[PDB]
Amino acid sequence: RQFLIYNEDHKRCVDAVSPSAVQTAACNQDAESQKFRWVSESQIMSVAFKLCLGVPSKTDWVAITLYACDSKSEFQKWECKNDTLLGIKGEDLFFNYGNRQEKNIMLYKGSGLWSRWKIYGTTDNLCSRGYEAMYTLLGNANGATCAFPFKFENKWYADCTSAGRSDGWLWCGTTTDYDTDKLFGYCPLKFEGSESLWNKDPLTSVSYQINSKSALTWHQARKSCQQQNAELLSITEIHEQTYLTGLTSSLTSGLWIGLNSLSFNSGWQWSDRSPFRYLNWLPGSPSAEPGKSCVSLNPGKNAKWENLECVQKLGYICKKGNTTLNSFVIPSESDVPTHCPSQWWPYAGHCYKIHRDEKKIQRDALTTCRKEGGDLTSIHTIEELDFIISQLGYEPNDELWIGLNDIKIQMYFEWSDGTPVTFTKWLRGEPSHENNRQEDCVVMKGKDGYWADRGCEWPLGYICKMKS
């Protein structure tokens, strides 16, 4: 994420010569003095010197030099303007080439070519590479973010290091003076041994990372997974729950997983957009108390789930990988010219119709769909859900049976027509109260056609979808 700062007009690059001299030289990508990187939302640090570029004051024609990095100093905060302009934050003054008299780099009112900078090698500005907090793994800092620069054995370190360690793992101090506070962690980056931080499941090849020594909020936890090209754990199959129950059987403190109700207009959902089709709540969850929108896996209570306040500082599980297990059935393709019986309307090779003639409990409804040559409808895309609520005479106060249910295995929803569950859109507060029955059927209700699970023993209208 390092870079050289490059001036196209001069075809030359910024070079740090001393804490009191920042100049330019020929663009040498192997010269550390010309290497720079963001270390916060607004500061840019010299890799060679571990000091941030700054100005003595927000005033015209002053020298830009290296200062001790400081998150509160208005005089080291930078931002990109126009495109290639790099300006001190809050004022129309700009990182400028200077002149052969100073040789130094200068702050200046002028927005010409001498004030316009892009990342060497690239054609995009400096804010394109940007800065992200980097949460540590294992270590004693409980997952705190790296602090750049940091002091280790009276030496300063610009990025993560394998110094003071013969195993070669990459670490960082989480306060600037590691020699004093002694707080560290391992960096979420590739190195020989990096992968032994993951448990790969031999059945599916999906990888899992159990961060039980950490205390992050839900949102912090999610960002630590995302920066590892992963995401918070989704639990989509009976097997996956079981593998994870095994992996955490020795733990007791809760661990964040990706299940949340943060979107207002809908209900429970996985942060990786997996369908929410396998349920494993602890008794008394999900609780309806309004602050508890993020879900934790409780390894000390058999790896069942509970929703908590998203600000609690727990451990977390990340999940990386695509499963090798093919599904048993794949949906059969459609037939682009589809003819439909009377009062049935096509979409994507299937005909649909809403029944409200006489309400039936879910089983009688499903029976009537099959006497008519189809089933209770399955839904696999938001496009398909939009078709149903738009083109079939659907009304916002409707409550209609669809094919989702867990009559085979409770807590595991399947489509009555046997197609895989690729997509779920739960109503706000749904699904709920599977603990109060043994069969969960699923209706479509509300202005948006979102789904609620309920008891199957209830007379309702229903939606049928025939075959191709």
Side-chain angles (χ1 to χ4, degrees):
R1 266 147 206 113
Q2 292 184 0
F3 48 88
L4 302 206
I5 325 185
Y6 172 81
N7 179 256
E8 243 187 68
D9 191 354
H10 288 271
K11 289 166 38 179
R12 282 160 67 85
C13 287
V14 183
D15 186 295
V17 179
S18 93
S20 315
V22 185
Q23 305 182 352
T24 66
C27 296
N28 179 20
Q29 257 180 328
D30 303 307
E32 195 194 4
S33 50
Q34 317 186 8
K35 302 200 193 144
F36 299 84
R37 57 169 285 206
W38 302 82
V39 294
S40 95
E41 190 199 1
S42 33
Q43 313 172 225
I44 302 157
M45 178 175 79
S46 175
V47 163
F49 281 104
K50 298 70 175 196
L51 300 155
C52 289
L53 286 155
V55 299
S57 62
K58 298 180 164 196
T59 44
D60 193 13
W61 201 254
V62 296
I64 297 167
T65 49
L66 299 167
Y67 299 65
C69 291
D70 174 3
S71 52
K72 299 193 180 197
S73 180
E74 319 263 27
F75 310 113
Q76 342 168 344
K77 310 197 155 278
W78 302 94
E79 66 192 353
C80 304
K81 286 205 197 76
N82 244 40
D83 173 34
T84 44
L85 285 191
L86 184 64
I88 212 83
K89 187 160 166 205
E91 302 285 328
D92 275 301
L93 297 151
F94 306 112
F95 202 91
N96 188 278
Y97 193 88
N99 52 24
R100 300 180 176 174
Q101 165 166 293
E102 326 259 14
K103 279 172 86 182
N104 207 94
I105 294 299
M106 305 289 311
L107 190 63
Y108 194 43
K109 304 187 304 295
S111 63
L113 291 193
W114 293 27
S115 287
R116 297 196 173 260
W117 308 85
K118 50 192 38 178
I119 304 190
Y120 183 50
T122 325
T123 89
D124 310 278
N125 63 39
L126 288 303
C127 297
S128 70
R129 282 199 189 294
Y131 160 88
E132 175 187 13
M134 159 157 308
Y135 300 83
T136 46
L137 306 168
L138 302 178
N140 58 10
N142 294 135
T145 52
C146 291
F148 297 115
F150 65 89
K151 188 169 83 93
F152 169 74
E153 300 194 334
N154 300 320
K155 205 93 192 182
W156 292 95
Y157 284 98
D159 219 282
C160 297
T161 184
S162 71
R165 213 167 303 264
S166 49
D167 53 32
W169 284 37
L170 288 189
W171 70 280
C172 80
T174 51
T175 62
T176 33
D177 189 11
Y178 168 75
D179 288 332
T180 303
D181 315 293
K182 291 273 173 186
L183 298 176
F184 79 109
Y186 296 100
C187 297
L189 306 160
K190 290 267 170 181
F191 52 86
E192 234 189 63
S194 157
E195 275 311 305
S196 62
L197 294 178
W198 297 81
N199 293 99
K200 199 188 279 255
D201 179 3
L203 190 73
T204 57
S205 74
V206 173
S207 293
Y208 300 94
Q209 191 189 67
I210 317 291
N211 300 305
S212 51
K213 282 180 60 169
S214 292
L216 312 181
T217 64
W218 191 88
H219 300 263
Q220 292 174 304
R222 180 170 195 198
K223 292 162 189 109
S224 192
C225 300
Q226 289 171 328
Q227 67 193 201
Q228 309 190 69
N229 299 316
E231 170 69 48
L232 286 168
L233 175 68
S234 47
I235 305 172
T236 39
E237 309 294 357
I238 309 110
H239 163 67
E240 191 164 38
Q241 175 63 46
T242 288
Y243 183 74
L244 267 309
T245 304
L247 275 189
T248 65
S249 48
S250 321
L251 305 173
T252 81
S253 303
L255 300 140
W256 287 122
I257 67 175
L259 184 68
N260 71 79
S261 49
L262 297 171
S263 301
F264 196 105
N265 210 28
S266 49
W268 297 103
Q269 61 190 4
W270 290 108
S271 66
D272 62 16
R273 290 174 303 289
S274 297
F276 181 53
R277 54 95 50 98
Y278 167 69
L279 282 53
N280 191 23
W281 296 105
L282 269 163
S285 301
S287 95
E289 297 183 14
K292 303 176 166 225
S293 283
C294 293
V295 172
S296 174
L297 180 146
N298 193 333
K301 302 196 166 185
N302 229 17
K304 293 178 152 294
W305 311 337
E306 53 185 342
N307 56 330
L308 305 169
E309 291 157 68
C310 302
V311 305
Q312 290 191 225
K313 292 196 157 176
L314 306 166
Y316 57 109
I317 298 163
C318 298
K319 170 176 153 188
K320 181 180 62 164
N322 284 321
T323 185
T324 52
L325 288 189
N326 300 295
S327 72
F328 273 117
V329 282
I330 45 95
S332 83
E333 46 184 355
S334 35
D335 201 342
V336 165
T338 175
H339 314 342
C340 292
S342 176
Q343 311 156 332
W344 294 65
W345 300 100
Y347 170 83
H350 298 252
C351 305
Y352 302 71
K353 172 164 176 177
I354 290 178
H355 290 273
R356 344 174 192 259
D357 45 352
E358 41 190 319
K359 324 200 191 100
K360 320 196 165 180
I361 66 180
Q362 191 253 31
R363 281 211 182 76
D364 301 336
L366 159 58
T367 286
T368 303
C369 287
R370 302 196 161 183
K371 312 213 288 194
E372 290 174 351
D375 205 323
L376 286 176
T377 187
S378 57
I379 323 182
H380 306 95
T381 56
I382 185 70
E383 293 77 10
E384 184 178 15
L385 180 67
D386 182 51
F387 163 82
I388 296 172
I389 69 176
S390 159
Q391 299 284 274
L392 304 177
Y394 180 86
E395 306 283 20
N397 50 333
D398 266 331
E399 186 178 352
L400 308 176
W401 287 120
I402 65 176
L404 201 75
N405 70 92
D406 64 346
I407 287 158
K408 297 161 66 165
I409 313 91
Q410 214 199 356
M411 308 314 174
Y412 186 87
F413 291 95
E414 304 175 57
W415 287 117
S416 66
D417 65 17
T419 48
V421 174
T422 45
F423 174 79
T424 41
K425 266 287 182 179
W426 299 104
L427 243 208
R428 176 165 166 88
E430 296 288 347
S432 48
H433 293 126
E434 307 80 22
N435 43 302
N436 294 333
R437 34 173 135 85
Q438 295 77 35
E439 300 193 341
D440 311 307
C441 290
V442 168
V443 306
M444 170 172 317
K445 75 193 282 201
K447 97 184 184 78
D448 298 306
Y450 293 169
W451 312 339
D453 77 333
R454 59 165 320 165
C456 306
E457 184 71 17
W458 202 281
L460 299 174
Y462 46 105
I463 307 172
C464 301
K465 169 181 168 181
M466 356 173 319
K467 314 171 187 165
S468 42

